[PDB]
Amino acid sequence: SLLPKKEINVYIGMSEMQVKWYQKILEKDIDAVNGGKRESKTRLLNIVMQLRKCCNHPYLFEGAEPGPPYTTDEHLIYNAGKMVVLDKLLKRIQKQGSRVLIFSQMSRLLDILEDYCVFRGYKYCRIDGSTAHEDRIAAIDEYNKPGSDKFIFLLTTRAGGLGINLTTADIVILYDSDWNPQADLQAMDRAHRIGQTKQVVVYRFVTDNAIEEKVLERAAQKLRLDQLVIQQGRAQVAAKAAANKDELLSMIQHGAEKVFQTKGAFGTMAEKGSQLDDDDIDAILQAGETRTKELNARYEKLGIDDLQKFTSESAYEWNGED
Amino acid sequence: KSLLPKKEINVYIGMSEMQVKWYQKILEKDIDAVNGAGGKRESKTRLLNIVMQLRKCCNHPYLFEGAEPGPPYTTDEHLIYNAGKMVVLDKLLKRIQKQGSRVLIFSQMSRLLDILEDYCVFRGYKYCRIDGSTAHEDRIAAIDEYNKPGSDKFIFLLTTRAGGLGINLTTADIVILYDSDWNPQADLQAMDRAHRIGQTKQVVVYRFVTDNAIEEKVLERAAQKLRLDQLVIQQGRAQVAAKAAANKDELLSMIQHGAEKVFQTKGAFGTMAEKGSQLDDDDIDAILQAGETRTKELNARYEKLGIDDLQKFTSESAYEWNGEDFA
Amino acid sequence: KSLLPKKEINVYIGMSEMQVKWYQKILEKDIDAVNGAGGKRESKTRLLNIVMQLRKCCNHPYLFEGAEPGPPYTTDEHLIYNAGKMVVLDKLLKRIQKQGSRVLIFSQMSRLLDILEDYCVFRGYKYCRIDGSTAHEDRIAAIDEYNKPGSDKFIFLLTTRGINLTTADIVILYDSDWNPQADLQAMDRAHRIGQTKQVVVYRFVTDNAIEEKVLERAAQKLRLDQLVIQQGRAQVAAKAAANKDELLSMIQHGAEKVFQTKGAFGTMAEKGSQLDDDDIDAILQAGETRTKELNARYEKLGIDDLQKFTSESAYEWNGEDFAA
Amino acid sequence: SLLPKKEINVYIGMSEMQVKWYQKILEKDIDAVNGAGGKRESKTRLLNIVMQLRKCCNHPYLFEGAEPGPPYTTDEHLIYNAGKMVVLDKLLKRIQKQGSRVLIFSQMSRLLDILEDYCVFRGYKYCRIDGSTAHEDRIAAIDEYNKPGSDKFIFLLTTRAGGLGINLTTADIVILYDSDWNPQADLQAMDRAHRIGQTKQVVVYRFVTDNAIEEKVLERAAQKLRLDQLVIQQGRAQVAAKAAANKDELLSMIQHGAEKVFQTKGAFGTMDDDIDAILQAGETRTKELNARYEKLGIDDL
């Protein structure tokens, strides 16, 4: 029994320094912010990038961090709203005896997260995805050591590989989200997989009322779409399926008893047969129209769960009754 | 302009005494396969044969050789009362003409239209016919004989899977599917030869179904294939939407979201404005609690989407014409 | 009713001063594969890159980023006179509206329709647009508010890849689809049952460039499709068993002369006993003449002389629904 | 060098006896002949009349009670009662004189029975394969007829059992007494003689009853043979209609005008009085282009 993961979006604001740069990005291209039709997506894609960097940390922009000499200070935290929440969260996660994996889209943010963990004295490992194979093996094993010195693991979402195991941690923090919903999903399942004994909790830093909240909904819409496409994974399989042995038999046997029982004629031809009056014909038409709507509505509201023909339905064993 | 939705009505029909005799003969002459089975390899050829003969029985016994009363052979009233579907059709047509309606009659078997031809002449019904062997010049002349203003014809006999489609026969308002195609889109294709843009009246489609026989069970399997066909259409639509990259309109809404509140903000934003200083774990407990509330709320908007209500771009309905040509 | 056949006219267009520079630049950045005077091993994927960019160059240079003078991107007269096809389009549209005609403009690239959108606003052309990215609600609303009497719209921009736009009479294929049948669907949005006037289709082709060679190879595919269509007719007709009408004409053939006959028949009435080898030499002589004559009747048949029952042409719409 | 075969339709009439039995067939089902039945009727009733007329065209003795009553003898009446037998009698006489050997094909083995009684009556050595003869038996039949210095002269064959790939090139003349509905069946019967190993000109005689059902049978068969060779010669069409652009095809697309573009150093040639001069010059090239390719055939494409 693997305990299901608790995914929580934590909604964070921006410091004054972020707002200043966030405005500068919006200002220096206010025409595109207001929005010719010829131009490629590049002009808008750049603004999206700079707004996402600003939602991570203003120090990612050159000439933002306080002037020389550059010092690792408390303002490394207080100039980024996420770092504030991250500061108290880490101090409380280490308190409750939990270990945390911290992911991010930008490696240049992990550079800040390296300097932050030194300022607070947190032991950590790191995988950039520019780190070699024998290197990232050691970083995984150092964190997975029984009684590991490390406490935080900094990684970039895509670049860790596939199927790596970090079950020695039980908390996952997504500093920022990927455009692809499964990329973060594969990052949560680094701690939420077979071998994990404790409750996996995933925190997703989302800058409220900014671009990242709008980014999240798009990734939420595409994630639901993938679910709709997987849940209907046998629609094309069920449509092409030709006549089945157990179906072909029920087609032939349907009503065979009444056919064998009949000595005269059948339903319409026994009840009123060979001669119909329009009082008689209208009773047929109106009844058939009634049956037509019920037959449609009963099948119209169906789903793939009911329509699906499992592979064992082909393995006709015997007749239920002869 | 307004095109009235088509009324599709299953007309459940019984069988005459003669149909029962042959239907029994078909079941009896191969009773070992019906009551039991054979090797899976064997039975599919053996069962598909029984299915095909039973469908011939539901249409008309005279499709079997030696069925119609022995020599001499005359076209009389026995052509009608020996087939359940003919009896229903005979009075249905009589009502159809009196209400000023003209009817297209489709069928899977061309030899049945041969039976209907002899019936139409027997009643004095002017008719045309499209066999899929008719020839273009003959085809154009027969459609124009039936469609051209002030036409004399009343019944139009066609085979379902021989249209060569793109035909206009809007002068009829009633469509009779004497029997149904295994592929539902073929019968729906035949309906859209009268129920097409240019049609002005209410299209009524009568689908003959031999009740308590093989045709009724086929009717259900067609409704299943018709519904899951909608799912492939719908699953494909979600597949296109999931693969679609960000639009310039989508990107603009992403940048503009909250931009006005940012321009309006002179200090800090949100959680930083509300406390700012690294403060109490009661404030952090409020942050994580309210965020989890919005997480449950966010999922609820999207967890109720479902396959059947995605945004349409192409009006693809498996309950309407596919657009293909079955010849 | 009478539906006037569509007039399909290739309008061969040159290239602007700017286009030539980029067309050279495309060929120059991959000059080894173009020349073919070396290994000739160069992969087709490398060639498919040249073809696709040369089409963008044939369409409009501004499809390449950094070509158009830098930001802010403003719509002026340089939007027209930097592309050969736009110059032809600019005066063609002016003539089309003045003669009371409305035009559908199709294209393979939606980013070109975006260029056409900025052009249409620049000239004051009321328009609608179907990209295959517009919602059904708006598309059904766009077709109606284009067809309604007293419409203000004049141009309808669509991507090539059962819709009715018969209220327009002119179709412009700015660029061509590799599958000729895809263009015919785009044509049959005005040229269909419901059209009252003569449908004229203009196919823009960049003369003396890649678009001209595609036109020659597209005509082959369009002709080969006709031959396949015809082979199917000959295949089905050969597979057909005799009808009851065909068999009766075989039974009835000469039956009147047989009933008319009171003694022996034909050649047997001529002699009927063991007579001269002049009789057999005469039979074989007339038979060999009739044998040659019979072969001539069928030696003059061949493809394209086959009976139609279904009027399917490669030069007419398939009925297939085309989406990119 | 294999000489192309000569195929000559021998149009033949019917004896007085054939005229009677032809009329007896048409009259005993004259309602079907005059088309006085329902369209729903099965095809069997018409096909019955067809085979009866086919049997009458071959030989009247195929019908019961036709040959002169008791006593039953094999004389010249076996020949002068059938129009084809009269022609076949004189034609074999000429063939044997000029040193040729002949295969005789037929649809009906009950007619090969008649031809057997004919060959014995005329003194012609012969072999026979029916489709009722087993493998080893019909092997020895081939070897005897192909034997160097063969004793035989005629080979009576059913059109069914001939087309198997066997060799009968030691006969240079083929006589199809009656034609098959399938043009390739008779076509492969001629190839029993007309194939590698044949040294002489192969001549094929196709007996046809003129102004009777067999002439109309011949026309329809000649039609379906014409349909056959059309689909054969146009089999190269569907394989080329769907084919990705070959690497050397794409090269000509890229090279088209590349020489004109490089040396240009300016704007191209083109770059409402000018516009109507473009549409007019383009309309000329469109009509010429389509007319050049529309009449083309598979060999060019």
Side-chain angles (χ1 to χ4, degrees), chain A residues 14 23 33 39 84 92 208 218 253 259 291 300, chain B residues 24 34 95 211 227 248 253 256 262 269 278 285 294:
Chain A
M14 321 183 68
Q23 288 162 349
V33 178
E39 26 199 316
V84 173
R92 174 177 156 184
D208 204 336
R218 308 289 176 172
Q253 296 179 349
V259 175
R291 304 171 55 175
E300 282 171 349
Chain B
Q24 287 168 357
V34 177
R95 162 185 156 179
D211 203 356
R227 177 59 180 92
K248 255 186 294 180
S253 65
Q256 292 179 351
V262 172
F269 218 26
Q278 200 76 48
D285 286 11
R294 297 172 62 176

PDB file of all heavy atoms in Angstrom, chain A residues 14 23 33 39 84 92 208 218 253 259 291 300, chain B residues 24 34 95 211 227 248 253 256 262 269 278 285 294:
ATOM      1  N   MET A  14       4.617  38.843  -4.324  1.00  0.00           N
ATOM      2  CA  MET A  14       5.902  39.338  -4.797  1.00  0.00           C
ATOM      3  C   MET A  14       6.392  40.464  -3.899  1.00  0.00           C
ATOM      4  O   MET A  14       5.594  41.261  -3.395  1.00  0.00           O
ATOM      5  CB  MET A  14       5.803  39.838  -6.241  1.00  0.00           C
ATOM      6  CG  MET A  14       4.923  38.983  -7.136  1.00  0.00           C
ATOM      7  SD  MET A  14       4.897  39.557  -8.844  1.00  0.00           S
ATOM      8  CE  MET A  14       6.576  39.190  -9.341  1.00  0.00           C
ATOM      9  N   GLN A  23       7.203  45.360 -13.376  1.00  0.00           N
ATOM     10  CA  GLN A  23       6.702  46.526 -14.096  1.00  0.00           C
ATOM     11  C   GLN A  23       7.644  46.925 -15.224  1.00  0.00           C
ATOM     12  O   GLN A  23       7.191  47.280 -16.318  1.00  0.00           O
ATOM     13  CB  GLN A  23       6.498  47.690 -13.125  1.00  0.00           C
ATOM     14  CG  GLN A  23       5.310  47.514 -12.191  1.00  0.00           C
ATOM     15  CD  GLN A  23       5.374  48.431 -10.986  1.00  0.00           C
ATOM     16  OE1 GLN A  23       6.400  49.058 -10.720  1.00  0.00           O
ATOM     17  NE2 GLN A  23       4.274  48.513 -10.247  1.00  0.00           N
ATOM     18  N   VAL A  33       2.251  44.042 -24.528  1.00  0.00           N
ATOM     19  CA  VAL A  33       1.365  43.737 -23.408  1.00  0.00           C
ATOM     20  C   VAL A  33      -0.068  44.121 -23.749  1.00  0.00           C
ATOM     21  O   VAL A  33      -1.017  43.401 -23.417  1.00  0.00           O
ATOM     22  CB  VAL A  33       1.853  44.442 -22.128  1.00  0.00           C
ATOM     23  CG1 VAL A  33       0.906  44.162 -20.969  1.00  0.00           C
ATOM     24  CG2 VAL A  33       3.263  43.998 -21.783  1.00  0.00           C
ATOM     25  N   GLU A  39       3.715  39.314 -36.637  1.00  0.00           N
ATOM     26  CA  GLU A  39       4.868  38.978 -35.814  1.00  0.00           C
ATOM     27  C   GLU A  39       4.764  37.574 -35.233  1.00  0.00           C
ATOM     28  O   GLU A  39       3.689  37.123 -34.831  1.00  0.00           O
ATOM     29  CB  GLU A  39       5.018  40.001 -34.689  1.00  0.00           C
ATOM     30  CG  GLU A  39       3.719  40.682 -34.303  1.00  0.00           C
ATOM     31  CD  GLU A  39       3.946  41.973 -33.542  1.00  0.00           C
ATOM     32  OE1 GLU A  39       4.806  41.988 -32.638  1.00  0.00           O
ATOM     33  OE2 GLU A  39       3.272  42.976 -33.860  1.00  0.00           O
ATOM     34  N   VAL A  84      10.799  33.580   0.813  1.00  0.00           N
ATOM     35  CA  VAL A  84      10.271  33.805   2.157  1.00  0.00           C
ATOM     36  C   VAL A  84       9.501  32.580   2.632  1.00  0.00           C
ATOM     37  O   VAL A  84       9.759  32.044   3.718  1.00  0.00           O
ATOM     38  CB  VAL A  84       9.389  35.066   2.184  1.00  0.00           C
ATOM     39  CG1 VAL A  84       8.698  35.203   3.534  1.00  0.00           C
ATOM     40  CG2 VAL A  84      10.216  36.303   1.872  1.00  0.00           C
ATOM     41  N   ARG A  92      10.866  24.388   9.025  1.00  0.00           N
ATOM     42  CA  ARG A  92       9.832  23.589   9.667  1.00  0.00           C
ATOM     43  C   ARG A  92       9.824  22.149   9.174  1.00  0.00           C
ATOM     44  O   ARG A  92       9.436  21.244   9.922  1.00  0.00           O
ATOM     45  CB  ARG A  92       8.471  24.253   9.435  1.00  0.00           C
ATOM     46  CG  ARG A  92       7.256  23.476   9.909  1.00  0.00           C
ATOM     47  CD  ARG A  92       5.996  24.290   9.668  1.00  0.00           C
ATOM     48  NE  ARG A  92       4.798  23.462   9.566  1.00  0.00           N
ATOM     49  CZ  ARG A  92       3.590  23.936   9.279  1.00  0.00           C
ATOM     50  NH1 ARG A  92       3.421  25.234   9.067  1.00  0.00           N
ATOM     51  NH2 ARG A  92       2.551  23.116   9.203  1.00  0.00           N
ATOM     52  N   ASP A 208       0.686  34.417  -7.028  1.00  0.00           N
ATOM     53  CA  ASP A 208      -0.730  34.724  -7.166  1.00  0.00           C
ATOM     54  C   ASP A 208      -0.940  35.997  -7.982  1.00  0.00           C
ATOM     55  O   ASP A 208      -0.128  36.925  -7.949  1.00  0.00           O
ATOM     56  CB  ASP A 208      -1.375  34.875  -5.787  1.00  0.00           C
ATOM     57  CG  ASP A 208      -2.871  34.620  -5.807  1.00  0.00           C
ATOM     58  OD1 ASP A 208      -3.491  34.771  -6.881  1.00  0.00           O
ATOM     59  OD2 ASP A 208      -3.427  34.267  -4.746  1.00  0.00           O
ATOM     60  N   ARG A 218      -3.383  26.563 -17.549  1.00  0.00           N
ATOM     61  CA  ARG A 218      -3.122  25.942 -18.845  1.00  0.00           C
ATOM     62  C   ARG A 218      -2.581  24.529 -18.669  1.00  0.00           C
ATOM     63  O   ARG A 218      -3.016  23.594 -19.351  1.00  0.00           O
ATOM     64  CB  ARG A 218      -2.143  26.799 -19.648  1.00  0.00           C
ATOM     65  CG  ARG A 218      -2.540  28.262 -19.780  1.00  0.00           C
ATOM     66  CD  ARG A 218      -3.741  28.455 -20.693  1.00  0.00           C
ATOM     67  NE  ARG A 218      -4.157  29.854 -20.742  1.00  0.00           N
ATOM     68  CZ  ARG A 218      -5.084  30.334 -21.566  1.00  0.00           C
ATOM     69  NH1 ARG A 218      -5.695  29.529 -22.423  1.00  0.00           N
ATOM     70  NH2 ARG A 218      -5.396  31.623 -21.535  1.00  0.00           N
ATOM     71  N   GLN A 253     -29.387 -16.510 -32.194  1.00  0.00           N
ATOM     72  CA  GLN A 253     -30.306 -17.118 -31.240  1.00  0.00           C
ATOM     73  C   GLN A 253     -31.403 -16.170 -30.776  1.00  0.00           C
ATOM     74  O   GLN A 253     -32.358 -16.629 -30.140  1.00  0.00           O
ATOM     75  CB  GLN A 253     -29.537 -17.634 -30.021  1.00  0.00           C
ATOM     76  CG  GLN A 253     -28.557 -18.756 -30.324  1.00  0.00           C
ATOM     77  CD  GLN A 253     -27.802 -19.219 -29.092  1.00  0.00           C
ATOM     78  OE1 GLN A 253     -27.857 -18.583 -28.039  1.00  0.00           O
ATOM     79  NE2 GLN A 253     -27.091 -20.333 -29.218  1.00  0.00           N
ATOM     80  N   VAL A 259     -39.604 -18.216 -32.711  1.00  0.00           N
ATOM     81  CA  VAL A 259     -39.652 -18.698 -34.087  1.00  0.00           C
ATOM     82  C   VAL A 259     -39.941 -20.193 -34.115  1.00  0.00           C
ATOM     83  O   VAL A 259     -40.759 -20.665 -34.914  1.00  0.00           O
ATOM     84  CB  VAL A 259     -38.341 -18.362 -34.821  1.00  0.00           C
ATOM     85  CG1 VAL A 259     -38.354 -18.966 -36.212  1.00  0.00           C
ATOM     86  CG2 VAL A 259     -38.144 -16.858 -34.896  1.00  0.00           C
ATOM     87  N   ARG A 291     -40.155   3.162 -28.565  1.00  0.00           N
ATOM     88  CA  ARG A 291     -39.015   2.274 -28.367  1.00  0.00           C
ATOM     89  C   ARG A 291     -37.734   2.873 -28.929  1.00  0.00           C
ATOM     90  O   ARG A 291     -36.645   2.611 -28.404  1.00  0.00           O
ATOM     91  CB  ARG A 291     -39.292   0.920 -29.019  1.00  0.00           C
ATOM     92  CG  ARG A 291     -40.556   0.236 -28.529  1.00  0.00           C
ATOM     93  CD  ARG A 291     -40.878  -0.986 -29.374  1.00  0.00           C
ATOM     94  NE  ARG A 291     -39.758  -1.921 -29.424  1.00  0.00           N
ATOM     95  CZ  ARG A 291     -39.804  -3.110 -30.015  1.00  0.00           C
ATOM     96  NH1 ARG A 291     -40.919  -3.515 -30.608  1.00  0.00           N
ATOM     97  NH2 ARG A 291     -38.736  -3.896 -30.011  1.00  0.00           N
ATOM     98  N   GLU A 300     -27.155   6.394 -25.633  1.00  0.00           N
ATOM     99  CA  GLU A 300     -26.520   7.695 -25.823  1.00  0.00           C
ATOM    100  C   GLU A 300     -25.733   8.115 -24.588  1.00  0.00           C
ATOM    101  O   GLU A 300     -24.606   8.611 -24.699  1.00  0.00           O
ATOM    102  CB  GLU A 300     -27.572   8.754 -26.162  1.00  0.00           C
ATOM    103  CG  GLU A 300     -28.070   8.730 -27.599  1.00  0.00           C
ATOM    104  CD  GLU A 300     -29.259   9.651 -27.812  1.00  0.00           C
ATOM    105  OE1 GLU A 300     -29.824  10.134 -26.807  1.00  0.00           O
ATOM    106  OE2 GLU A 300     -29.628   9.893 -28.982  1.00  0.00           O
TER     107      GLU A 300
ATOM    108  N   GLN B  24     -37.249 -20.910 -39.627  1.00  0.00           N
ATOM    109  CA  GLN B  24     -37.043 -22.171 -38.925  1.00  0.00           C
ATOM    110  C   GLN B  24     -36.139 -23.098 -39.728  1.00  0.00           C
ATOM    111  O   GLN B  24     -35.241 -23.737 -39.168  1.00  0.00           O
ATOM    112  CB  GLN B  24     -38.389 -22.837 -38.656  1.00  0.00           C
ATOM    113  CG  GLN B  24     -39.206 -22.171 -37.563  1.00  0.00           C
ATOM    114  CD  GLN B  24     -40.636 -22.666 -37.527  1.00  0.00           C
ATOM    115  OE1 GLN B  24     -41.041 -23.483 -38.353  1.00  0.00           O
ATOM    116  NE2 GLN B  24     -41.412 -22.171 -36.571  1.00  0.00           N
ATOM    117  N   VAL B  34     -25.925 -23.469 -34.119  1.00  0.00           N
ATOM    118  CA  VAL B  34     -26.717 -22.489 -33.380  1.00  0.00           C
ATOM    119  C   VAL B  34     -26.819 -22.867 -31.907  1.00  0.00           C
ATOM    120  O   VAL B  34     -26.588 -22.034 -31.023  1.00  0.00           O
ATOM    121  CB  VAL B  34     -28.105 -22.334 -34.022  1.00  0.00           C
ATOM    122  CG1 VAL B  34     -28.959 -21.377 -33.203  1.00  0.00           C
ATOM    123  CG2 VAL B  34     -27.970 -21.849 -35.451  1.00  0.00           C
ATOM    124  N   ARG B  95     -50.650   5.743 -46.951  1.00  0.00           N
ATOM    125  CA  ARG B  95     -50.797   6.951 -46.148  1.00  0.00           C
ATOM    126  C   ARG B  95     -49.825   8.032 -46.608  1.00  0.00           C
ATOM    127  O   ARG B  95     -50.162   9.221 -46.596  1.00  0.00           O
ATOM    128  CB  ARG B  95     -50.577   6.631 -44.667  1.00  0.00           C
ATOM    129  CG  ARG B  95     -50.282   7.847 -43.794  1.00  0.00           C
ATOM    130  CD  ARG B  95     -49.959   7.449 -42.360  1.00  0.00           C
ATOM    131  NE  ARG B  95     -49.166   8.469 -41.678  1.00  0.00           N
ATOM    132  CZ  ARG B  95     -48.770   8.387 -40.411  1.00  0.00           C
ATOM    133  NH1 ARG B  95     -49.097   7.331 -39.679  1.00  0.00           N
ATOM    134  NH2 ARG B  95     -48.048   9.362 -39.875  1.00  0.00           N
ATOM    135  N   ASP B 211     -38.852  -7.404 -35.449  1.00  0.00           N
ATOM    136  CA  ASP B 211     -38.831  -7.573 -34.003  1.00  0.00           C
ATOM    137  C   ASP B 211     -38.781  -9.049 -33.619  1.00  0.00           C
ATOM    138  O   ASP B 211     -39.343  -9.913 -34.299  1.00  0.00           O
ATOM    139  CB  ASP B 211     -40.052  -6.902 -33.375  1.00  0.00           C
ATOM    140  CG  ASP B 211     -39.840  -6.555 -31.917  1.00  0.00           C
ATOM    141  OD1 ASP B 211     -38.769  -6.899 -31.371  1.00  0.00           O
ATOM    142  OD2 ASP B 211     -40.740  -5.927 -31.321  1.00  0.00           O
ATOM    143  N   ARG B 227     -22.472   4.851 -30.823  1.00  0.00           N
ATOM    144  CA  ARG B 227     -22.114   5.660 -29.658  1.00  0.00           C
ATOM    145  C   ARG B 227     -20.608   5.698 -29.416  1.00  0.00           C
ATOM    146  O   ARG B 227     -20.044   6.767 -29.162  1.00  0.00           O
ATOM    147  CB  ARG B 227     -22.833   5.133 -28.415  1.00  0.00           C
ATOM    148  CG  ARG B 227     -22.476   5.862 -27.123  1.00  0.00           C
ATOM    149  CD  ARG B 227     -22.790   7.350 -27.202  1.00  0.00           C
ATOM    150  NE  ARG B 227     -22.442   8.052 -25.969  1.00  0.00           N
ATOM    151  CZ  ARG B 227     -21.268   8.633 -25.742  1.00  0.00           C
ATOM    152  NH1 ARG B 227     -20.325   8.605 -26.673  1.00  0.00           N
ATOM    153  NH2 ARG B 227     -21.039   9.247 -24.590  1.00  0.00           N
ATOM    154  N   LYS B 248      -1.106  32.966 -29.749  1.00  0.00           N
ATOM    155  CA  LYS B 248      -0.761  34.343 -29.410  1.00  0.00           C
ATOM    156  C   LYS B 248      -1.845  34.984 -28.556  1.00  0.00           C
ATOM    157  O   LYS B 248      -1.552  35.863 -27.740  1.00  0.00           O
ATOM    158  CB  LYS B 248      -0.501  35.186 -30.659  1.00  0.00           C
ATOM    159  CG  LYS B 248       0.984  35.455 -30.887  1.00  0.00           C
ATOM    160  CD  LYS B 248       1.229  36.416 -32.041  1.00  0.00           C
ATOM    161  CE  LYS B 248       0.821  35.859 -33.388  1.00  0.00           C
ATOM    162  NZ  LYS B 248       1.103  36.856 -34.460  1.00  0.00           N
ATOM    163  N   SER B 253      -3.210  36.546 -22.872  1.00  0.00           N
ATOM    164  CA  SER B 253      -3.972  36.424 -21.635  1.00  0.00           C
ATOM    165  C   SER B 253      -3.082  36.005 -20.473  1.00  0.00           C
ATOM    166  O   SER B 253      -3.369  36.347 -19.320  1.00  0.00           O
ATOM    167  CB  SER B 253      -5.113  35.425 -21.818  1.00  0.00           C
ATOM    168  OG  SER B 253      -4.612  34.120 -22.058  1.00  0.00           O
ATOM    169  N   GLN B 256      -1.087  39.348 -19.547  1.00  0.00           N
ATOM    170  CA  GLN B 256      -1.957  40.398 -19.031  1.00  0.00           C
ATOM    171  C   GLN B 256      -2.599  40.044 -17.694  1.00  0.00           C
ATOM    172  O   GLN B 256      -3.101  40.944 -17.012  1.00  0.00           O
ATOM    173  CB  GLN B 256      -3.046  40.721 -20.052  1.00  0.00           C
ATOM    174  CG  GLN B 256      -2.535  41.393 -21.316  1.00  0.00           C
ATOM    175  CD  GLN B 256      -3.646  41.666 -22.308  1.00  0.00           C
ATOM    176  OE1 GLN B 256      -4.775  41.211 -22.128  1.00  0.00           O
ATOM    177  NE2 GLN B 256      -3.334  42.414 -23.361  1.00  0.00           N
ATOM    178  N   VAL B 262      -0.456  44.794 -10.856  1.00  0.00           N
ATOM    179  CA  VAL B 262       0.972  45.026 -10.663  1.00  0.00           C
ATOM    180  C   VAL B 262       1.309  46.490 -10.922  1.00  0.00           C
ATOM    181  O   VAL B 262       2.044  47.120 -10.152  1.00  0.00           O
ATOM    182  CB  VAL B 262       1.795  44.092 -11.567  1.00  0.00           C
ATOM    183  CG1 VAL B 262       3.266  44.470 -11.509  1.00  0.00           C
ATOM    184  CG2 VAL B 262       1.598  42.643 -11.153  1.00  0.00           C
ATOM    185  N   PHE B 269       3.450  42.796  -3.061  1.00  0.00           N
ATOM    186  CA  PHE B 269       2.306  42.113  -3.649  1.00  0.00           C
ATOM    187  C   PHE B 269       1.839  40.978  -2.750  1.00  0.00           C
ATOM    188  O   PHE B 269       2.646  40.150  -2.320  1.00  0.00           O
ATOM    189  CB  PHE B 269       2.649  41.557  -5.034  1.00  0.00           C
ATOM    190  CG  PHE B 269       1.529  41.670  -6.031  1.00  0.00           C
ATOM    191  CD1 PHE B 269       0.559  42.648  -5.896  1.00  0.00           C
ATOM    192  CD2 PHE B 269       1.446  40.796  -7.104  1.00  0.00           C
ATOM    193  CE1 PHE B 269      -0.471  42.758  -6.814  1.00  0.00           C
ATOM    194  CE2 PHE B 269       0.418  40.899  -8.025  1.00  0.00           C
ATOM    195  CZ  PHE B 269      -0.541  41.881  -7.879  1.00  0.00           C
ATOM    196  N   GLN B 278       9.572  37.976   7.408  1.00  0.00           N
ATOM    197  CA  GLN B 278       9.528  36.554   7.725  1.00  0.00           C
ATOM    198  C   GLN B 278       8.832  36.368   9.066  1.00  0.00           C
ATOM    199  O   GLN B 278       9.430  36.623  10.116  1.00  0.00           O
ATOM    200  CB  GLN B 278      10.937  35.961   7.764  1.00  0.00           C
ATOM    201  CG  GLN B 278      10.985  34.453   7.611  1.00  0.00           C
ATOM    202  CD  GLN B 278      10.772  34.007   6.178  1.00  0.00           C
ATOM    203  OE1 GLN B 278      11.393  34.535   5.254  1.00  0.00           O
ATOM    204  NE2 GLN B 278       9.889  33.036   5.984  1.00  0.00           N
ATOM    205  N   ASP B 285       0.684  28.695   8.248  1.00  0.00           N
ATOM    206  CA  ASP B 285      -0.406  27.727   8.324  1.00  0.00           C
ATOM    207  C   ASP B 285      -1.651  28.244   7.622  1.00  0.00           C
ATOM    208  O   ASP B 285      -2.455  27.452   7.115  1.00  0.00           O
ATOM    209  CB  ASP B 285      -0.723  27.392   9.782  1.00  0.00           C
ATOM    210  CG  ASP B 285       0.319  26.488  10.417  1.00  0.00           C
ATOM    211  OD1 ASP B 285       1.392  26.293   9.807  1.00  0.00           O
ATOM    212  OD2 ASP B 285       0.066  25.973  11.525  1.00  0.00           O
ATOM    213  N   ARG B 294      -7.928  26.155  -2.554  1.00  0.00           N
ATOM    214  CA  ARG B 294      -7.966  26.486  -3.972  1.00  0.00           C
ATOM    215  C   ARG B 294      -7.515  25.313  -4.833  1.00  0.00           C
ATOM    216  O   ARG B 294      -7.926  25.206  -5.994  1.00  0.00           O
ATOM    217  CB  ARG B 294      -7.097  27.718  -4.222  1.00  0.00           C
ATOM    218  CG  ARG B 294      -7.609  28.955  -3.499  1.00  0.00           C
ATOM    219  CD  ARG B 294      -6.639  30.119  -3.598  1.00  0.00           C
ATOM    220  NE  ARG B 294      -6.410  30.553  -4.971  1.00  0.00           N
ATOM    221  CZ  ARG B 294      -5.667  31.603  -5.302  1.00  0.00           C
ATOM    222  NH1 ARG B 294      -5.081  32.325  -4.355  1.00  0.00           N
ATOM    223  NH2 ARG B 294      -5.505  31.930  -6.576  1.00  0.00           N
TER     224      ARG B 294
END
